[PDB]
């Protein structure tokens, strides 16, 4: 049965069979196969049942009940006897058991099964592979080998009937005090180690906090840590303890809030930039044209496109030169998150320059348009906007080479022309 | 010769706790089961380092480190037969139990 | 009981080659000599991992990895006395031979 | 003596003492201390001598000769006897030896030394620590323990009397064929691994070549590898083989030649640059002013200084803006090695701009000088040089703000003024 009383080894067996235990962890040797001088007892096959051995209600081992069927083999010619060894190897340990069995002369039928004998039991750790051998002494036939596998702590039998499966550093979260709290309902005497890391995708290592502790404990989170990939790792301070990994911020709102709050754009070369962020979220990027008025930065799509940018990886510009009025806009989930103008300290601040977009029509003509806040206006135009009133002077500026080229194509080009001469 | 009792004193300890050490190790090893019916234990497990170097975080071999076996002398019992006068004799066997990752010796001039 | 001969068969092999494994290992260990005059071997060396984590290239502890002992069951001989009828009995001792560096188990939800 | 014949164990002893060997690697047990029923033989102290055991002239083990002095202790009350065990522990192995010793009744003097007995020998590996115990059976006194240490393969005794110490992958160098050759005079059957690395100082890892081989072999070097810190590492393909490290290019001339040939300057930020080199040599750096004429780049010391620059580490400029005529000169051992103008593609090529160096005299005056190839010339000057003829126009250009400031100080400033208006 599943639970057995105190660790007294036990052997029972079939009706009418005599069975005595000799187990002193005995020395077991199968030796060579000798011929049978008449009828011998011989084991037919092996079988195993999983049991539990509790010495106190607290300490319970996984115990393996072994059984062996017996038949009468050998030569044919008043009751029979034998002694059978059950060897139990389960790296690193091993234990052997010797059983004495008598079978009466009335159950002696040459060529049938005469009964079976059952031993409880072999203790073994969780999830350990167990070789079990069985043989008569002396050995008249081949040995009996069985290779089994015990269940993990996961598995209804184990974790329900075993109390030893519950040393979990139980974790709870409490974001109610305007901050976030981590509660560790463990035992008072629990020594354990705790790690807070930023779970990057490719190249995961990003440690953030490490501590040896003796809980239970409640840890408070800083506003700089709440990012999506912020994950927790816990384990008791024991040799080869098992570590628990959880990411409860995978979809916290303030997590993404602080994540994009902490993201930064930083220039490398004139034609290479970099994005810094605690976590790695999907995002697209594109260059933007910012007027000196302030925020109304019109993205340059077309002739550009939103290219994917990955955190901690370089994206390269397609520009010929940089300009103080060239920002970079970074969106994620099709929502503008970051807007940083990377040339504002190297070449800035924003100059009073108008952006022009020329399109090479058929026959390699050239038609020009000026990107104003109210969309683009073709030149020359009859409007009262600042660009249309002075469009002729702007064309004179371009065809004299006074404008700065920023992008060249086969059927398109971009320019910027200063306006300080008219103001 | 003297009397050797058949029962084996058992420590009763069950300190055994790790699992799949041989595969989780940075110096992984394979096992070879040697079998002898006139030897106790009949099954003697011999380890063998799988590689010369150690396995890095990416699962590739690192030849800057060496996997080295840990060997220990142990005793087994040999069963001997000289007709009716069965006797036993102790025998020393060298067992490789596992491997560890060590820094190679750097002799220099 | 049966006859145990006093001589010990020796393998004669001298495979023993490494040196200072315990210090060169990424999972270094310390030794503890246990002594018993009525036990063979009288000196039984027990290893103990020096740290929980493993030692990195800079010589600092790395808690992302675990140092774990490699334990093996061995046999020793116990000398017993019952006046003139001196007898011997086998005894199983669990010996920690060294340590290895393993990746910790990462259970997750 | 040093070399002994075939591995037959041997025991000899003092004049008049009978000594028989029983070593079957015997089972040794010191046990408890029993009282002495009259006089007993007792070991006084232990001593060791280092020997060599050769079974064939090829295979020789380090062997340790053990000896023990004997006295007569115990109670005082026809010749004496005893049996003494020498235990030899040397992790991982151990071996025990039993000796029978008779001493005649005429040498029996209570309170003196009665002789000594010598056993050859205990084989042990090189450099292995050896515990040696000795005790009588039965044991009447405390045990005798000695802890020794055997010599390394280095050590005249070892490497001269042992042939096993010579598996060296012998290395030779041959730079005669206009290239460099590495010869590995080993045995034909030698399996070994070979590594070529660039021996950096801080953060050493810089692998360059790895190969499993079965030599002997001759390796040819490419012109891109001959650098000073290029070092070789070799070891046989055996468990825990010993690796040899050698750096024969520490002072090869063509090594440094190719090293500075391969060094590169590369811009990060406008005010940060980087030096790439296979090895890490000491070097100083300073900004330089290059005329459009070509090579005659005059270093800007003063007002600058040669700051140390380390390989694979950033150095930061002290400039306000970058200029196409600003190169960086890098010297080592006070010899100009590299000269690279980092703004020649971002803002270049060289502009026709004259460099000016103003010095704020007392009362915060301003006196100006123009850096020409023939040193500096104060302005205004009466010379016929291009700067002195047009010095008045240059002062007019500066005081109108048309010149570009590059460095500001409390008592100094640097400027650059374009010259296209006069040519």
Curated annotation (Swiss-Prot), chains A, D:
Domain of life: Eukaryota
Conditions for induction: By HGF and VEGF.
Keyword field contains Magnesium: no
Disulfide cross-links: 153-165, 229-279, 231-247, 288-297, 327-341, 369-376, 403-417
Glycosylation sites: 145, 172, 185, 212, 222, 308, 331, 365
Subcellular location: Cell membrane
Tissue: Expressed in prostate, skeletal muscle, kidney and placenta (at protein level). Expressed in brain, cartilage, colon, heart, intestine, kidney, liver, lung, muscle, placenta, and prostate. Also detected in thyroid, trachea and adrenal gland. Low expression in thymus and leukocytes.
GO biological process, one term: granulocyte chemotaxis
Keyword RNA-binding: no
Gene Ontology CC annotation, any one: plasma membrane
Function of the protein: Receptor for IL17A and IL17F, major effector cytokines of innate and adaptive immune system involved in antimicrobial host defense and maintenance of tissue integrity. Receptor for IL17A and IL17F, major effector cytokines of innate and adaptive immune system involved in antimicrobial host defense and maintenance of tissue integrity. Receptor for IL17A and IL17F homodimers as part of a heterodimeric complex with IL17RA. Receptor for the heterodimer formed by IL17A and IL17B as part of a heterodimeric complex with IL17RA.
Protein name: Interleukin-17 receptor C
Lineage summary: Eukaryota, Metazoa, Chordata, Craniata, Vertebrata
Gene expressing this chain: IL17RC
Residues of the whole record sequence present: 21 to 535 of 791
Curated annotation (Swiss-Prot), chains B, C:
Keyword Metal-binding found: no
GO MF assignments: cytokine activity; cytokine binding; cytokine receptor binding; protein heterodimerization activity; protein homodimerization activity
Subcellular location: Secreted
GO cellular component, one term: extracellular space
Chain positions carrying an annotated carbohydrate: 30
Tissue-wise expression: Expressed in T-helper 1 and T-helper 2 cells, basophils and mast cells.
Chief location: secreted
Cysteine disulfide partners in this protein: 49-99, 54-101
UniProt GO BP: adaptive immune response; cartilage development; defense response to Gram-negative bacterium; defense response to Gram-positive bacterium; inflammatory response; innate immune response; interleukin-17-mediated signaling pathway; negative regulation of angiogenesis
Key words of the record: Adaptive immunity, Cytokine, Disease variant, Disulfide bond, Glycoprotein, Immunity, Inflammatory response, Innate immunity, Secreted, Signal
Protein purpose: Effector cytokine of innate and adaptive immune system involved in antimicrobial host defense and maintenance of tissue integrity. IL17A-IL17F signals via IL17RA-IL17RC heterodimeric receptor complex, triggering homotypic interaction of IL17RA and IL17RC chains with TRAF3IP2 adapter through SEFIR domains. This leads to downstream TRAF6-mediated activation of NF-kappa-B and MAPkinase pathways ultimately resulting in transcriptional activation of cytokines, chemokines, antimicrobial peptides and matrix metalloproteinases, with potential strong immune inflammation.
Disease per record: Candidiasis, familial, 6: A primary immunodeficiency disorder with altered immune responses and impaired clearance of fungal infections, selective against Candida. It is characterized by persistent and/or recurrent infections of the skin, nails and mucous membranes caused by organisms of the genus Candida, mainly Candida albicans.
Family: Belongs to the IL-17 family.
Subunit structure, interactors included: Homodimer; disulfide-linked. Heterodimer with IL17A (IL17A-IL17F). Forms complexes with IL17RA and IL17RC receptors with 2:1 binding stoichiometry: two receptor chains for one interleukin molecule. IL17F homodimer forms predominantly complexes with IL17RC homodimer, whereas IL17A-IL17F favors complexes with IL17RA-IL17RC. IL17RA and IL17RC chains cannot distinguish between IL17A and IL17F molecules, potentially enabling the formation of topologically distinct complexes.
Protein name: Interleukin-17F
Name of encoding gene: IL17F
Residues of the full protein shown: 54 to 162 of 163
């Amino acid at each position: 049965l599943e639970r057995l009383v105190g660790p007294q080894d036990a052997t029972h067996c079939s009706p009418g069979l005599s069975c005595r235990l000799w187990d002193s962890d005995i020395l077991c040797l199968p030796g060579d196969i000798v011929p049978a001088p008449g009828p011998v007892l011989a084991p037919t096959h092996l079988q195993t049942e999983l049991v539990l051995r509790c010495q106190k209600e607290t300490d319970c081992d996984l115990c393996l009940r072994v059984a062996v069927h017996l038949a009468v083999h050998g030569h044919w010619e008043a009751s029979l006897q034998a002694q059978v060894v059950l060897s139990f190897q389960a790296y690193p340990t091993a234990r052997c058991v010797l059983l004495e069995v008598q079978v009466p002369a009335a159950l002696v039928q040459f060529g049938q099964s005469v009964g079976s004998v059952v031993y409880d039991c072999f203790e073994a750790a969780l999830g350990s592979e167990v070789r079990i051998w069985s043989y008569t002494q002396p050995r008249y036939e081949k040995e009996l080998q069985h290779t089994q596998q015990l269940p993990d702590c996961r598995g209804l039998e184990v974790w329900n009937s075993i109390p030893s499966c519950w040393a979990l550093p139980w974790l709870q979260v409490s974001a109610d005090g305007d901050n976030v709290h981590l509660v560790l309902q463990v035992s008072e005497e629990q020594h354990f180690g705790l790690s807070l890391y930023w779970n990057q995708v490719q190249g995961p290592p990003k440690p953030r906090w490490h501590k040896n502790l003796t809980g239970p404990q409640i840890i408070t989170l800083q506003h700089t840590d709440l990012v999506p990939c912020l994950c927790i790792q816990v384990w008791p301070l024991e040799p080869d303890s098992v570590r628990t990994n959880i990411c409860p911020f995978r979809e916290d709102p303030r997590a993404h809030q602080n994540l994009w709050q902490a993201a930064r754009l930083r220039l490398l070369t004139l034609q290479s930039w970099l994005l810094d962020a605690p976590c790695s979220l999907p995002a697209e990027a594109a260059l933007c044209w910012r007027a000196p008025g302030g925020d109304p930065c019109q993205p340059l799509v077309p002739p550009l496109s939103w290219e994917q940018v990955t955190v901690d990886k370089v994206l390269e510009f397609p520009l010929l030169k940089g300009h103080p009025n060239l920002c970079v806009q970074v969106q994620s989930s099709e929502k503008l998150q970051l807007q940083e103008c990377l040339w504002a300290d190297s070449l800035g601040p924003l100059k009073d320059d108008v952006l022009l977009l020329e399109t090479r029509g058929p026959q390699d003509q050239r038609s020009l348009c000026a990107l104003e806040p109210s969309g683009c206006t073709s030149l020359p135009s009859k409007a009262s906007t600042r660009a249309a009133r002075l469009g002729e002077y702007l064309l004179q500026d371009l065809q004299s080479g006074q404008c700065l080229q920023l992008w060249d194509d086969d059927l398109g080009a971009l320019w910027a022309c200063p306006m300080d001469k008219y103001i | 010769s003297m009397k050797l009792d058949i029962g084996i004193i058992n420590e009763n300890q069950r300190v055994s706790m790790s699992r799949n050490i041989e595969s989780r190790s940075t110096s992984p090893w394979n096992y070879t089961v040697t079998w002898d019916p006139n030897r106790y234990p009949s099954e003697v497990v011999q380890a063998q380092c799988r590689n010369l170097g150690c396995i890095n975080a990416q699962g590739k071999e690192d030849i800057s480190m060496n996997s080295v076996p840990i060997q220990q002398e142990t005793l087994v019992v040999r069963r001997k037969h000289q007709g009716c006068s069965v006797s036993f004799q102790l025998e020393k066997v060298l067992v490789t139990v596992g491997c560890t990752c060590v820094t190679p010796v750097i002799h220099h001039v």
